[PDB]
Amino acid sequence: AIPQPKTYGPLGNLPLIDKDKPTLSFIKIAEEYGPIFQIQTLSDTIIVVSGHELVAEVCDETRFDKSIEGALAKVRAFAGDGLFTSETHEPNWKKAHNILMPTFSQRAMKDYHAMMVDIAVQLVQKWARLNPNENVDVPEDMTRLTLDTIGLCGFNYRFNSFYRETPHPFITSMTRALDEAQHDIQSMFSLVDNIIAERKSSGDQEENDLLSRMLNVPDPETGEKLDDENIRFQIITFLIAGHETTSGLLSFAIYFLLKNPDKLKKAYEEVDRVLTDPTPTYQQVMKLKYMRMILNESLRLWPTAPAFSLYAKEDTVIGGKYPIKKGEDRISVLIPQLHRDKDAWGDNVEEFQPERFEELDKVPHHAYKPFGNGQRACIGMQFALHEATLVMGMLLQHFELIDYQNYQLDVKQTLTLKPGDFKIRILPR
Numbered sequence: 001a002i003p004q005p006k007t008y009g010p011l012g013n014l015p016l017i018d019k020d021k022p023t024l025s026f027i028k029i030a031e032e033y034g035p036i037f038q039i040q041t042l043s044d045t046i047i048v049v050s051g052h053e054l055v056a057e058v059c060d061e062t063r064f065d066k067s068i069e070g071a072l073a074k075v076r077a078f079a080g081d082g083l084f085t086s087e088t089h090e091p092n093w094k095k096a097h098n099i100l101m102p103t104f105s106q107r108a109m110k111d112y113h114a115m116m117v118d119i120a121v122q123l124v125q126k127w128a129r130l131n132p133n134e135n136v137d138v139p140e141d142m143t144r145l146t147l148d149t150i151g152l153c154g155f156n157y158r159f160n161s162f163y164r165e166t167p168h169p170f171i172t173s174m175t176r177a178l179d180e181a182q183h184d185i186q187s188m189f190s191l192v193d194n195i196i197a198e199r200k201s202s203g204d205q206e207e208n209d210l211l212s213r214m215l216n217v218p219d220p221e222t223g224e225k226l227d228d229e230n231i232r233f234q235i236i237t238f239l240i241a242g243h244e245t246t247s248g249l250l251s252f253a254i255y256f257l258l259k260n261p262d263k264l265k266k267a268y269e270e271v272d273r274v275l276t277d278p279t280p281t282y283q284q285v286m287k288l289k290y291m292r293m294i295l296n297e298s299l300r301l302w303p304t305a306p307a308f309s310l311y312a313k314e315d316t317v318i319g320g321k322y323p324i325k326k327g328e329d330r331i332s333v334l335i336p337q338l339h340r341d342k343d344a345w346g347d348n349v350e351e352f353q354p355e356r357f358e359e360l361d362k363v364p365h366h367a368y369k370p371f372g373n374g375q376r377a378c379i380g381m382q383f384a385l386h387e388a389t390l391v392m393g394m395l396l397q398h399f400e401l402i403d404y405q406n407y408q409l410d411v412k413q414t415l416t417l418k419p420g421d422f423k424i425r426i427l428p429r
């Protein structure tokens with residue numbers, strides 16, 4: 001039987017978790033009960049898997065599929081049947097997957113690079129125009145950048161987050177729809193439908209982005225284009241799935257570089273050697289290999305999307321001993337503990353060492369899952385890593401980052417993980 005922490009009659013296992021800190025709570029219980037355990041709530045049971053062998057076993061696509069059972073079922077209210085919140089067997093999933101997969105390749109990022117630079121320059125100019133001793137809020141400015149980059153690169157819409165003191169009506173409306181996990185959802189649907197209507201009427205200009213892609217390219221298997229409602233769901237899906245996770249990545253990367261001076265010094269080395277022009281080029285961004293290893297290490301230590309869920313396709317066993325009823329038990333992957341599995345990663349799991357990714361043969365894959373698994377893995381992986389590398393390189397090109405308050409990490413979790421109350425100061429170089 002699957003290990004279980006305790007039980008308190010009607011209360012299940014909930015007396016052992018902080019409802020506001022689910023991932024961290026599960027980390028604690030994992031430290032107590034090992035690579036697999038089950039948590040009983042008032043209504044259901046969750047199986048939390050964290051050992052790399054069991055995680056790899058549950059990652060077998062023949063036996064397990066993506067589950068949308070809990071948080072994602074709430075996100076579904078406004079994300080609908082988009083890539084993030086649709087079941088694999090639903091038709092629009094593989095339709096949109098085939099349609100949009102080439103646009104998210106690394107070669108396709110060559111097409112988005114300019115727009116990414118646009119928003120990056122905005123961030124840099126903001127920080128350069130600060131008055132002496134003004135503080136910057138790393139998560140909020142990173143979120144400004146990530147939301148604007150996704151809007152511009154994806155459907156050529158400028159949120160202009162850097163022209164606002166309070167985050168955009170869309171992002172607070174989205175936070176209200178998520179803190180539910182109707183007014184707001186309808187306003188979101190209409191804004192997206194407005195951009196879609198602007199594009200379908202007089203769609204002359206070669207915008208060459210995600211919306212034009214969904215309007216032009218059909219699914220080669222079915223021969224069909226995505227319908228309008230699903231395109232709306234896809235645009236909302238890109239916004240939610242991209243901006244928060246990628247801004248969390250940027251914030252954690254800035255934190256780790258501030259707390260590990262050697263890695264920052266090496267990053268300065270690489271950026272100065274590569275970033276010679278005022279604005280980076282796509283080729284130059286790819287040359288920033290050490291920065292991308294810094295990002296890989298940051299995602300290992302604090303995966304901004306800390307979990308994904310699976311369901312069993314037919315009755316089976318894990319580890320040779322733990323049974324799973326078919327399609328009834330929701331398996332949650334505890335990505336931080338998986339990323340701290342010493343048998344797969346070694347002993348220095350808590351150290352910030354980008355050099356773990358120095359040699360692409362040595363990285364223990366299937367114990368490194370910051371972007372999900374298999375066919376339901378993150379379609380925006382290359383988008384996110386390219387954008388994050390660009391922003392980090394540019395910030396290091398222009399700025400000296402100062403830990404003026406001696407920041408003490410506090411991992412806040414909403415739907416994603418991020419540093420809470422993270423403020424620094426900046427100087428020009």
Ligand code: HEM
Pocket residue numbers: 066083084085097150237238241242243245246249303304305307308309370371372373375376377378379380381383384
């Ligand atoms: C650091 C940045 C990011 C992280 C850590 C991340 C993480 C993830 C994870 C873990 C999943 C799998 C979720 C599950 O299987 O339940 C996923 C899926 C997805 N992500 Fe990302 N993501 C990031 C950036 C982005 C960006 C930039 C975009 C879009 C521009 C995006 C769009 C999506 C979509 C559409 C899916 C659904 C994939 C499918 O099953 O078809 N993500 N992401």
Ligand SMILES: CCCCCCCCCCCCCCCC(=O)O
Pocket residue numbers: 014015016017018019021024025028
């Ligand atoms: C930063 C560390 C976070 C760790 C989260 C562990 C907190 C939960 C420990 C057991 C529950 C104790 C109180 C939680 C609230 C409650 O019981 O109503």
